């Protein structure tokens, strides 16, 4: 985040798996791996997206 | 000649340096020379309704197919 | 025991899986019977009157 | 040693983590973490399901207003999360289920606003109704207003209408909703979100019933009720208003007893 | 081990203080109750203390047995048009309020209870009439038996239904009941329904009434005086008191603070308002 | 047995309004569900509205709601029916009857009723 | 000594209980019972959702007509069971999915019927198209018949509308559908009802793929076709009909990657 | 079977060789074969309010900054 | 020995099954 100090909040990072209709709302990104950041003191925030693939390798 | 026995205890109070806990007994004493005049214990014992509901002469295997 | 919703206690039913099938020159139409019971786990409390039973006078 | 604060908090269930930088700790309702159904207190036959990660996962409900004129703000439990995916769906499809609850209230401003809200979790909030004629006769619609929630009102006001009632709650803030004062309320579990502090609450609540497992369709366990302790005021503005969110959560929850869909008549 | 009966923390002596140590401050945003004694802030003196907290303890704040009922039975000439008049009280604490409210600061007990009945009496026409001593039944009709019809029907056979017969002018009756109810602890506050309103079905046959569970029903009890038809009519009245023992609770609730309407939470207009007035700067 | 003590008939013409009132004696408390009803002269006899005593609830027929109302006097064990409207097809003998309850179920026509009223007749004249 | 026969078998899993008189013993495809995802052959590295008793149970598919001119009836899995409770929904809620079955195809007449059901279990059962010009090209919905699957039939018919083709299948009988003489069919896992023997047949499926574990709503693992090898014929009877029912059960079954509900365009 | 235990004792009488000093008991003898009629013993135990007053997760250490 | 007021025979955790044990099966003509 790069805003001034005072500024602040929480935003929502989120991954879906492949196969469904891709998320458009809050609504249904939440209900995946989502990770809720808070803005503060520690200026980044990381999100892992784990590796849930059906192959053993994607093309 | 007392007849002290236990209470099965249900609700526990906050107790059991008295109450509670430590196994709950009660006292009677019976008062007349006649049986017949005994307070029922409620002590009683309890069977295998099996004189009743398996009364077939040769064994019940639940398992097993039940005509053989 | 008694008619209550809160405790309620659910539904039985029977449904045929395929069809009773009968060969020719036999009954069309059979039946059956059924059996209620408990089991070793079943226990009853706290005594009252019947209702299956009254002496009007 | 290594700087960790007592505001810096990572909750992490199922596939979702929500982190935080301005936490006042959190609290474990009565001092009980929740936990799966002992064999000691069983009660239902049947193998228990236990959707593990497909439920215990964090859900976030949709977002409120905070104004002035904000009275404040209620949501019952499972009720809330009755849309949230399997923890919806396992719901529905069983008779009994058990559930605990971590809800983190999230809700930031800046060093320039000012205000302070409480994070209540009472145990069986039942709520009075609107119509001073007619005794708990509430529907069931309105007494379970899902993932939107009901609110708070300044003023008690008579369903009047006794043709065709309104049948619905008009609970009034000061009397905690239930004609208790809130200045008592601070003995459920419970946390201030005091702006010039923190910026959220975390209350982790075990499952607290009657019975060893219940019905979740019929019988909501627990209730969030939030109310703005000091009133929000911003700059020299006349109309600040920063939201405020809940995401809850769903742990160690079991259901007994599949069986058919239940279509509950929601309207 | 520490019973209700010990003795207080004694107060340890305490002198001045100048140091990185905070006592004082807290922020109870935390929602953790700031755990001072009085030595923290203060200098103290060596104290010991004799105080105990005996009297407070769940069991002693039940300890007094309270009036929930009052109902009315009589027996009437049998020359009379009116039926002779036996009552019918459905178990309910909720009847009256204060054992309702000392029994509202909890969500949840469980508590074996004690009956007792006072029975009072007198005449009504002003007839120099005389009147035996009464005879008086009390049968505990639980959940689901058949409900006296007449003051004289078969339901009072009491066949099983364990049933009281105090003579009039006795010491009072008393029974003792064990833990009833049909869970682990009686509900106090029942949020839901009974009934799920299903959609595919009528909202009728869907619909039942909030807060209103099978958790706190417990039968009736019938009062009937047994002496037949008296040629001069007499009343009587008869009071129940009840007093939990071996009680226990869970999770504590506020009191309830405007009046009490009808045995739901709920609550009627004009009666929202507890506080008085009073000054924010005058002492 | 409960007995349910009716009152009061009357023919009186288009767009009238009379009252019944009807006693729990009995002992209207948590048990009766006082229903209304009429009897069509013999095609003909149908359920109104019906209140629920332990919380004062009421439901009408479908002909009925609206103009008619059930109203409850509750510590006077009298349940009463303001008879609104009453246009010459509101001639019919009417009734009063009271079943028992299910512990929080609604009194609903499909539920009750025990028990059975005096059935004291109101008409309504035509014009 | 106690009369155990390789007739009477007694299916039980999750709340239900197939029992048998008839059978002919059971059949363990493969011979490997189904089982759950090892961790020498794990892949995805999520927590995977084991549903168990709340997906480990025998649902019941639509019966079917049984008569002379019954050329075949095909359903593919996990298709079929897609509207199959608990089992359903955590299909949907998923990426990937694995999943054992065992099938239980019964079907009974009487001493005085005769003829022959096949049941096969064929891994990866691609079927044949109904145009000559068009190769691979049938849609989605018609792939996917759920839970009335779809038939064989004794003539290969073209897809003539070259506007706008039917876009489905066409399998023909003796052909196993696709293009391989039914005669051989027989390498696949399993069973024949013999009217004369047996009234069901029992084959145990455990998940066969090339994945360790794989998306369900894409992929379909395997394939119950049930051809009639002796055609049906009764008494002297002009117009005979008995019924068959197909009731599968997930078995070991586990998901992974929790998201959002996927709504498949059936039609 | 009885149940003697002792008094907490107030008001001490001028008395040491029976009342007073040497610690008071009283005997109580349960009369009923049913827990649920025995007299409340009241001799109940107590617990400490940190299962309400300090149900913070990290405990607290009252010296030290409640926010670190 | 077994009183009147002894607990009720533990209920067993059973899992998934497929043999040729048929519990489920009678036949009351035998009367039992
Ligand atoms: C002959 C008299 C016998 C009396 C038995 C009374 C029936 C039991 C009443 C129990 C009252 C308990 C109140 C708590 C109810 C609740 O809040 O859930």
């Given at each position: 985040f790069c805003g001034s100090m005072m500024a602040t909040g929480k935003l929502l990072v989120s991954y879906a798996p492949p196969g469904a209709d891709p998320p458009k709302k809050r609504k249904e990104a939440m209900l995946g791996t989502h990770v809720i950041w808070d803005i503060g003191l520690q200026s980044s925030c990381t999100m892992v997206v784990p590796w849930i693939s059906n192959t053993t390798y994607r093309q | 000649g007392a007849q002290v026995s236990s209470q099965k205890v249900?609700?526990?109070?906050?107790?059991?340096?008295?109450?509670?806990?430590?196994t709950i007994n009660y006292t009677t004493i019976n008062?007349?020379?006649?049986?017949?005049?005994n307070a029922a214990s409620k002590q009683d014992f309890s069977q295998d309704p099996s004189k009743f509901t398996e009364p077939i002469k040769d064994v019940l295997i639940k398992t097993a197919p039940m005509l053989n | 025991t008694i008619d209550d919703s809160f405790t309620e206690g659910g539904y039985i039913s029977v449904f045929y899986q395929t069809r009773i099938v009968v060969p020719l020159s036999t009954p069309r139409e059979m039946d059956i019977l059924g059996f209620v019971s408990a089991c070793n786990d079943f226990s009853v409390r706290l005594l009252r009157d019947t209702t299956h039973i009254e002496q009007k006078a | 040693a290594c700087g960790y604060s007592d505001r810096v908090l990572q909750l992490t269930l199922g596939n979702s983590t929500i982190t935080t930088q301005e936490a006042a700790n959190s609290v474990v309702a009565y001092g009980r973490w929740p936990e799966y159904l002992r064999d000691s207190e069983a009660n239902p036959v049947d193998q228990p399901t236990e959707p593990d990660v497909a439920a215990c996962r964090f859900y976030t409900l949709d977002t409120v207003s905070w104004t002035k004129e904000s009275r404040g703000w209620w949501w019952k439990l499972p009720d809330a999360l009755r849309d949230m995916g399997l923890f919806g769906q396992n719901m529905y499809y069983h008779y009994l289920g058990r559930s605990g609850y971590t809800v983190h209230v999230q809700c930031n401003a800046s060093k320039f606003h000012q205000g302070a809200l409480g994070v209540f979790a009472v145990p069986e909030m039942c709520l009075a109704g609107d119509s001073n004629t007619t005794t708990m006769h509430t529907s069931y619609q309105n007494a379970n207003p899902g993932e939107k929630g009901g609110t708070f009102t300044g003023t008690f006001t008579p369903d009047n209408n006794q043709t065709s009632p309104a049948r619905r709650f008009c609970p009034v803030d000061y009397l905690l909703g239930n004609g208790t004062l809130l200045g008592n309320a601070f003995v459920f579990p419970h946390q201030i979100i005091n702006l010039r502090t923190n910026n959220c609450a975390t209350l982790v609540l075990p499952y607290v019933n009657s019975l060893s497992i219940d019905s979740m369709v019929k019988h909501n366990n627990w209730g969030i009720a939030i109310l703005p302790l000091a009133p929000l005021n911003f700059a020299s503005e006349s109309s600040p208003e920063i939201p405020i969110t809940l995401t809850i959560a769903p742990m160690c929850c079991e259901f007994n007893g599949l069986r058919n869909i239940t279509l509950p008549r929601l309207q | 081990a520490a019973t209700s009966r010990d003795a207080l923390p004694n107060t340890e002596a305490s002198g001045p203080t100048h140091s990185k140590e905070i006592p004082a401050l807290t922020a109870v945003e935390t929602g953790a109750t700031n755990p001072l004694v009085p030595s923290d802030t203060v200098q103290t003196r060596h104290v010991v203390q004799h105080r105990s907290r005996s009297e407070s303890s769940i069991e002693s704040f039940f300890a007094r047995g309270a009036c929930v009922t009052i109902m009315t039975v009589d027996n009437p000439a049998s020359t009379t048009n009116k039926d002779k008049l036996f009552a019918v009280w459905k178990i309910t604490y909720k009847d009256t309020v204060q054992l309702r409210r000392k029994l509202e600061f909890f969500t949840y007990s469980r508590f074996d209870m004690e009956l007792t009945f006072v029975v009072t009496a007198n005449f009504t026409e002003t007839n120099n009439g005389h009147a035996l001593n009464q005879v008086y039944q009390i049968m505990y009709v639980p959940p689901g038996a058949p409900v006296p019809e007449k003051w004289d029907d078969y339901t009072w056979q009491t066949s099983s239904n364990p049933s009281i017969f105090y003579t009039y002018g006795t010491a009072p009756a008393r029974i003792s009941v064990p833990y009833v109810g049909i869970s682990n602890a009686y509900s106090h506050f029942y949020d839901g329904f009974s009934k799920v309103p299903l959609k595919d079905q009528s909202a009728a046959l869907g619909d039942s009434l909030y807060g209103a569970a099978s958790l706190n029903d417990f039968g009736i009890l019938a009062v009937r005086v047994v002496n037949d038809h008296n040629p001069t009519k007499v009343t009587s009245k008869i009071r129940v008191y009840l007093k939990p023992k071996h009680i226990r609770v869970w999770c504590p609730r506020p009191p309830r603070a405007v009046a009490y309407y009808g045995p739901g939470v709920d609550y009627k207009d004009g009666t929202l308002t507890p506080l008085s007035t009073k000054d924010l700067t005058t002492y | 047995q409960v007995q349910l003590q009716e009152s009061g008939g009357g023919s009186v013409q288009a767009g009238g309004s009379l009252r019944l009132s009807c006693a729990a004696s009995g002992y209207q408390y948590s048990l009766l569900c006082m229903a209304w009803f009429r009897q069509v002269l013999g095609e003909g006899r149908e359920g109104v509205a019906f209140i629920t005593t332990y919380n004062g609830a009421m439901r009408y027929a479908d002909t009925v709601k609206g103009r008619f109302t059930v109203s409850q006097d509750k510590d006077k064990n009298t349940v009463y029916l303001?008879?609104?409207?009453?246009?010459?097809?509101?001639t019919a003998i009417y009734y009063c009857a009271a079943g028992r309850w299910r512990f929080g179920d609604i009194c609903h026509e499909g539920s009750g009723y025990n028990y059975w009223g005096q059935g004291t007749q109101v008409t309504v004249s035509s014009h």
């Open positions: - | 249900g609700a526990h109070e906050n107790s059991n340096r008295a109450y509670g806990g430590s008062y007349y020379r006649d049986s017949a005049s | - | - | - | 303001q008879m609104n409207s009453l246009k010459p097809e509101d």
